[model samples]
Target: GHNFERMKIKTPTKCGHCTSILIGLDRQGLFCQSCQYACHVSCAERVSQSCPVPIDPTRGVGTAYEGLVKTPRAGGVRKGWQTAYVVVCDFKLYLYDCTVQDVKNEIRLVLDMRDPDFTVCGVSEADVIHAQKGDIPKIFRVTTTQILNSSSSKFYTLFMAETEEEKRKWVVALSELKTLLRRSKLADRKAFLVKEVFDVTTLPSIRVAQCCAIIDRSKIVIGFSDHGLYCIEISRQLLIPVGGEKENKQRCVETVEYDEAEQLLMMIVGPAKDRHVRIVPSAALDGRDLKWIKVNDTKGCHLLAVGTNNPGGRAGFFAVAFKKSVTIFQIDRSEKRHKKWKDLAMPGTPQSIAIFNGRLYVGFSHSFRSWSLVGVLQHISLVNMEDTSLQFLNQQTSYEAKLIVNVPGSPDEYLLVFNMIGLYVNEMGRRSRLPEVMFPTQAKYFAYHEPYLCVFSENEVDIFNVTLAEWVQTINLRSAKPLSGDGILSTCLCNDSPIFVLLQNVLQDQDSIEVPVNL
Candidate 1:
């Protein structure tokens, strides 16, 4: 039996930045403070990073700045299971309660970006009635409605620019206004759209989107096929479009990623069929002539898409997915010279890609693959641009596979084979498959919310429970009622906490669907 008290023991150290309690030591032995962070001794040494003081382990029960710990009774059942809090782009928020072994306490909070009575609107009456009948009031309606009106719902927006002189002035004006309105208010409350809908529609043609990328929280990139791409500043309901028209149309934008150390946005504009890949910095958009670099040298590989993630060393990291290749590159900004690109090799042609926790996870045809452990050049040190040396991180002729993501948790990072089957991979080249689960449609977008997994297929979004050995039942998020046809193009969840999905409908007509992830 596990000792309950021992599990609640605390340490003594505070984060230098946030002053949060330093609970545990990282692999480096340096204490990592919550909210604010510190590195362990070993981790500090490896990265040449260091913390000011070594924590005195004997000092306190928990660490300084950290609140007291709670010890659960030995044999006491947890009130709930590990769940993901999701918020969708359509202003819907959901709390997935996993403790009940099935969908229960699944509450939805509808965020009204233009309302005044309630900053955050909650589920419809129909949903409340359904949840009440199911015996789970906490998740479906009651709890969400109460929490939506609580102090935490207060939040503000940041506007970019709102100039009237420019031709794209309408786009700039509206985007800026939305930003201002969102950022000017308290963070815990929601902004309703009931009264503000007319105001937003009349502002500008520039479509405003919430960027969850790590960098500039107040900045926005506006794309108009006829007006190119405009960087906007959002402050309340005011907007400012930074750059002029560089192109005719902006079809799609490879997901936005932030390079923290350099404070730059590597915006990759996809091929508008007739157009090639245009890579530009967000800062240079408003300057004289809208500076940009065209990457037209990928052999014959069409630049299908681009993605940016964690940055390391002297490289501004960017990932470009082409016809049959997913190339990871390091942008050199050391000297006052033209930005250079170094193509880091990857496994197969990746359909989609994401970087998290130092490992690059790629979603390909039927399997999700990790490039860190396999491929021709697993590790490369391009310190000398002239002498670009490649080192094989692994020696096996066969690729070192991680979880094969056929099923929900496989680390291999590959899409489900045949659009059906379950497999997961790890960094160590392990594969596990599940025969019980059925892949209803080709997965267009996939995100793992730890114990809960969500995937968007064609017209339907499927949510599954991955903690069990066999596949449990799933919740379909298409027609409100369980759906059978597939058509969801792309979807993603918000950062682990309070999940939200960004999705687009590819069938019938092109429309975006923003729904809460209720398990």
Candidate 2:
């Protein structure tokens, strides 16, 4: 008899039967002193024995239970026996015993088959060497190597059916499982090769995508001619409205620029009198709660350039170029206002403006004695307007300058100039023209990241390795129609990858897919 009073009366941390946590003291637990085992009071009743003990091996009985009596060697069909065992149901094998209850009621989970290392067919007939043996039944075994410890092995056994028709079904199911496992392993090792991520054609009412700018390296802000300003989340592939609403509405967004240090986005909105340059903090784009700071009236602003002084400080500046005049604004966050630094009237119409290393570079077209020559590049210090230098160009043309950008990560603040004719590289008061290569189509947009210069034309993208001073490769954009149009409107680099946004009118009937190029 078990002594209930002599049992230890202490809180148990875990139940010995199931190894589950013991919660409250409401359900009293018990511990055996002789066996050093602990269990819940209710768990002890469900178990067959009170405490775990070693089993006697010399009892002569088998490890499994013998519930049914075997049939003697008789004629064709043997009777007086329950024909119930384990059967496969929904990829899982279950033990069905008809001796105690019905087939469904006495079903117990035996094994769940999965992909394993090895499987063997036809168990040896010599293992079952009994009297009056005629034909041995088909048996298959599945063996799995240990995942954590590969030296150990685990196994399962399957007994085939009496008829050949039933045995064929079991073989088909196991073959299907093996094929599925091979496909899963192959998929893990496969790599994605040039898959389309998302398409902008599904967006509503967006006819013209005029300009695009990256904000904080996470979202891309695109401006449409008829529609308002919208931003696309790069990783999440979500498009949301940012500007051109009731409170923050604009006639049109002409250009978009960003300063990485101050984390500010500047936009030039148009229609002459209502034209103004708006400054938006990048963080406000999340809630669509934009508080646009009206910087200045950009009535005749044709070009825009923005840069930051320090990454830690919020002081940044932007330059707005009119037809013949350029105005530089000092963005002083400490004073909470944009102060106009210098407004200068150039000798000719200012084509483009860029700020690099606290100095302003303006590209203009001059009319020297009615020759109407494309002017030279001029630089002026932001701190002092008197400090200025102008580099004369030997060529005369009527077309406006295509690009004027300051190369980043360069010690001398090198400038890249591109026009309708050729590309020129300017570094520290010295200018050199690149090897004259005839373009199949006119250059539409130009962008550079470090040592690589990208020129977007009507049908292809021409990439030049500036360090090697040669054109490396050309990526074709239009394979169907090779006609000329405003090929690429704008190009920008995000995460060292170049992304080109095409003009809406260029691809009239076709769907334009803008894929980023990783070079």
Q: Which stretches of candidate 1 lie over 4 Å from their true place?
A: 1-217, 232-234, 245-255, 285-289, 296-316, 334-348, 354-363, 373-376, 379-422, 432-444, 447-453, 457-519
Give per-residue CA lDDT, model 1, range 1-519, as digits (tens).
111110111233333333323222111123334222442222233432243333122211111111111111212113322333222211222222233234322222222222332222123335333233322222221111111211122221111111213213323332443344455552322211100111123334423332223224344344434444555443343333434444424444433444555545444454445444455555553534554556555433433222233324444345566666655554555432124344544546555555443445565443454445222244321111232110121211322122223233443333222233343323333333222233333454444433434444432345544534222222222222111111111212111122122223222252222222222
Error of 2 at 373 (Å): 27
Listed per model in order, the count of residue pairs whose N, CA or C atoms clash below 3 Å is 113, 0
lDDT of 1 at 88: 24
Residues 1-519 of candidate 2: C-alpha lDDT, one tens digit per residue: 233211322322345555432322122255676676655454566654644455011211111221221222212123222244443332223334444434332222233333234343433455333312342343334332211111112333334344444444445655565454444442221111111222233433333555666563456677656555677776566767674354235447667776666667777876565667877776656646665677755666777777534333546567787877778787766533467777767767766666545556666542111111123134432112121322223333544554444444445434444443333344434333323222323456665544545555543455555544444434333221111111323432212233333322221353233433322
TM-score of each: 0.40, 0.47
Best by TM-score: 2
Off by over 4 Å in 2: 1-197, 234-237, 243-245, 248-251, 308-314, 334-337, 366-395, 405-410, 413-415, 421-428, 432-440, 479-519
Q: What is the C-alpha RMSD of each candidate to the true structure, in Å?
A: 19.9, 30.8
